[PDB]
Design a binder for this molecule. Structure first.
Ligand SMILES: CC(=O)c1ccc2c(c1)/C(=C(/NC1CCN(C)CC1)c1ccccc1)C(=O)N2
Length: 349
């Protein structure tokens, strides 16, 4: 076996690097970011992920600066960070030692779809609540993920703990400062972004989460668009044609898509029979045309659909106890503090 010893700066605490050794490196991910590895530590024998990205002198890494401000159980923790040379030494890379999680929400949802089965509502409740909890934390700093999809939602099959990953698209949204329109994966792309909105709030992650929720309820994406324009046709097929005021509320740059008035399709008819009415009520308040009309991540966590997790007698289908879901902080509750009366039940008080 080959051992790799490097001096890496820890993500949290003071900027003081330490000698970190790792072995058994293998390629597990490949994307727009760069490359993701899986390595075993020499100290505890713990498995960690190493995301190698090509870095320049012109500026500092945007993802790294967002990552070392973040400390939450439902987001992959930045263990360490170091610099390596792999292009005749003239070009340098940024390696991010992050948490390793075996499965993803996509892979778990795929298992049921291939077996013609439905994902149990308890799993839909646990995965969605943890996504909105991590969203309430990132949005309190002004940071918007801009890439919410089941492939980026990591999963541990035994404990059922969800973790958010890939903060490359992520940016601290500021009022007045424009942003790029073509962002997020097509099936989870908000209608503002299709309408060419450069000025948007962190409510685009709320829409993307709503797209994931409906996907876990249907067993397939709700809006499978063939093109960038065919994506809006998929949305119009269930939500109907947006009103004059709904269009303006998205703040659209260069509009006039020229589509016929088809009108909204009932939410109950969209999903399978005997689908919990609370899931539909939640999905209706997340997948809204008007971004300001959408439920906030904390408001989504306080919804009637996640009341089963708030029960003191709730447990995982494998017998194990549900993870920490009520250990909220002042930074998490920052947007709406009186919501703590619903979010934190008397048993956990
Ligand atoms: C993208 C990023 O920033 C990041 C950060 C930390 C991470 C991962 C990704 C990650 C991934 N793990 C997969 C390993 C293979 N199994 C079968 C599925 C899960 C992974 C890799 C590529 C795409 C999506 C997810 C993990 O375990 N820890």
């Amino acid at each position: 076996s080959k051992v790799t010893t490097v001096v890496a700066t820890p993500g949290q605490g003071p900027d003081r690097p330490q000698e970190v050794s790792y072995t058994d490196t293998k390629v597990i991910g490949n994307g727009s970011f760069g490359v993701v590895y899986q390595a075993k530590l020499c100290d505890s024998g713990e498995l960690v992920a190493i995301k190698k990205v090509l870095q320049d002198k012109r500026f500092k890494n945007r993802e790294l600066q967002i990552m070392r401000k973040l400390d939450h159980c439902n987001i992959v923790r930045l263990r360490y960070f170091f610099y390596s040379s792999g292009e005749k030494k003239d070009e340098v890379y940024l390696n991010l030692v992050l948490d390793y999680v075996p499965e993803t929400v996509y892979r778990v949802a795929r298992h049921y779809s291939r077996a013609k089965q439905t994902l149990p509502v308890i799993y839909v409740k646990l995965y969605m609540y943890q996504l909105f909890r991590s969203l309430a934390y990132i949005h309190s700093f002004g940071i918007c993920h801009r890439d919410i999809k089941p492939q980026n939602l990591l999963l541990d099959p035994d404990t059922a703990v969800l973790k958010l990953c890939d903060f490359g698209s992520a940016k601290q949204l500021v009022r007045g400062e424009p942003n790029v329109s073509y962002i997020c994966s097509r099936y989870y792309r908000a209608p503002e972004l299709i309408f060419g909105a450069t000025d948007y709030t962190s409510s685009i992650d709320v829409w993307s989460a709503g797209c994931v929720l409906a996907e876990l309820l249907l067993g397939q994406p709700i809006f499978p668009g063939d093109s960038g324009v065919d994506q809006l046709v998929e949305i119009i097929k269930v939500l109907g044609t947006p009103t004059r005021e709904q269009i303006r509320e998205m703040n659209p740059n260069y509009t006039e898509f020229k589509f016929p008035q088809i009108k909204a399709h009932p939410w109950t008819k969209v999903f399978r029979p005997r689908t919990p009415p609370e899931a539909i009520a939640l999905c209706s308040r997340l997948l809204e045309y008007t971004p300001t009309a959408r439920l906030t991540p904390l408001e989504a966590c306080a919804h009637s659909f996640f009341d089963e997790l708030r029960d003191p007698n709730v447990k995982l289908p494998n017998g194990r106890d549900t993870p920490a879901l009520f250990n909220f902080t002042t930074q998490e509750l920052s947007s709406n503090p009186p919501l703590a009366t619903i979010l934190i039940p008397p048993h956990a008080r």
